[PDB]
């Protein structure tokens, strides 16, 4: 099986700047090295087939390079709906052959998340537990801190975190942290809060509410 | 010329399951259609195609004595078995035409242009357990968010749809993630102006389909 070893594993760069994915081989494939686009949810797209020639449809900055064992994959001006994964693969002998993949990130300036807080629904509560939710919207970049507090009381290994792909025109990131207790536990506390922590923010900010 | 594979299913370590694929669009022959999987988050492995000369398949060396791929011409549909299946054989498993081009005494060197939507197949032991759906109701500038969440459920597979699709800007349904009892649970949130409160109706549609379970659950304040 011919070894496909391709860098790097992962990239990010600004809209605009130039970005070059490598692919090289184990022996000789002499031209049939194939590129693919993976966008995040989707089956990947066939973007240049045999090394060079460019699949029409698929924007200009992408190009394909080399011959032989040494292949490159060229993209001239990256923008937002780029965001994706990219693979190379050989078709020269029977067992095809794929490359680690690339995951491409796009890097923009700082935007402030805007924050919503969501108390436990009347009918979950009737199922024995409840889960409090918070929501931080279109913000950028990633890392960011949410605190959850009952009655001041930070809470700790109650909460889980999901986080979506980067946003394919604004590059932003979404997180939802979702805070889960007993309902006796929720129904003896009265005070419940969300603090967040980013970039975007001159100093936290917390989305709070009383049960009642 | 599009290909549609068959549904998200579980399977039970040691069994056996068959994946379909079916060419609906122009003239395409199924015996021209390969298989490639992808593990959660993992990247793709290729699994095995139909040499076109004798139209025998040949298999990975992975999959060999585990894999059986057939084609139907007149179905214009392909079929892709994987027995004996444990864990690691959970993933996305992709179809992909092989159309003929650069070739040479009888075999070709093209690339996989149409590909299927892929099925995930997730073997474990674990019941098929239906979601639970609970409305995110709302409460700076006149922007507003609402939303639904969808609890304890398993397997992973779950679509949310806002206003039967009518609602597209703005949604963010986020990735599941695993709870303590090894259920499911994810939100899908909409950011709405403030104006629209009452004087809009906001659904949404989730369908977990290894349960068969659709539900609308309508949020409002």
């Known amino acids: 099986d011919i070894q496909m070893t391709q860098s790097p594993s992962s990239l990010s760069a600004s809209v605009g700047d130039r970005v070059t994915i490598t692919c090289r081989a184990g022996?000789?494939?002499?031209?049939?090295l194939n590129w693919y686009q993976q966008k995040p949810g989707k089956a990947p797209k066939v973007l240049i087939y045999?090394?060079?020639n460019l699949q029409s449809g698929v924007p200009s900055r992408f190009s394909g390079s080399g011959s032989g064992t040494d292949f490159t994959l060229t993209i001239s001006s990256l923008q937002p709906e780029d965001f994706a994964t990219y693979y190379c693969?050989?078709?020269?002998?029977?067992?095809?052959?794929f490359g680690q993949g690339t995951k491409v990130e796009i890097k923009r300036t700082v935007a402030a998340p805007s924050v919503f807080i969501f108390p436990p629904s009347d009918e979950q509560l009737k199922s024995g537990t409840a889960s409090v939710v918070c929501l931080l919207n279109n913000f950028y970049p990633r890392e960011a801190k949410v605190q959850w507090k009952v009655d001041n009381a930070l809470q700790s290994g109650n909460s889980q975190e999901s986080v979506t792909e980067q946003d394919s025109k604004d590059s932003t990131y979404s997180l939802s942290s979702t805070l889960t207790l007993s309902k006796a536990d929720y129904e003896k506390h009265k005070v419940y809060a969300c603090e967040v922590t980013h970039q975007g923010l001159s100093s936290p900010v917390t989305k709070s509410f009383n049960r009642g | 010329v599009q290909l549609v594979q068959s549904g998200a299913e579980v399977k039970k370590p040691g069994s056996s399951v068959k994946v379909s694929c079916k060419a609906s669009?122009?003239?395409?022959?199924?015996?021209?259609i390969s298989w490639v999987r992808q593990a959660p988050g993992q990247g793709l492995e290729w699994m095995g195609g139909?040499?076109?000369?004798?139209?025998?398949?040949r298999y990975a060396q992975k999959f060999q004595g585990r894999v059986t791929m057939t084609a139907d011409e007149s179905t214009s549909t392909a079929y892709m078995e994987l027995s004996s299946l444990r864990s690691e054989d959970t993933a996305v498993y992709y179809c992909?035409?092989?159309?003929?081009?650069?070739?040479?005494?009888?075999?070709?060197?093209?690339?996989?242009?149409?590909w299927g939507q892929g099925t995930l197949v997730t073997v474990s032991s674990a019941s098929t357990k239906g979601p639970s759906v609970f409305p995110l109701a709302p409460s700076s500038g006149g922007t507003a968010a609402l939303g639904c969440l969808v609890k304890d459920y398993f397997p992973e597979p779950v679509t949310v749809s806002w206003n039967s699709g009518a609602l597209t800007s703005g949604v963010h349904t986020f990735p599941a993630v695993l709870q303590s009892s090894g259920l499911y649970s994810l939100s899908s949130v909409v950011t709405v102006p403030s104006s629209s409160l009452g004087t809009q109706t906001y659904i949404c549609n989730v369908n977990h389909k290894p349960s068969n379970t659709k539900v609308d659950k309508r949020v409002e304040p």
């Open positions: 992909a035409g092989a159309l003929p081009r650069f070739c040479s005494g009888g075999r070709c060197s093209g690339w996989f242009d149409p």
């Open positions: 669009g122009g003239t395409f022959s199924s015996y021209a």
């Open positions: 139909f040499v076109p000369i004798s139209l025998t398949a």
């Open positions: 022996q000789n494939i002499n031209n049939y």
């Open positions: 045999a090394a060079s």
């Open positions: 693969q050989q078709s020269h002998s029977t067992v095809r052959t």
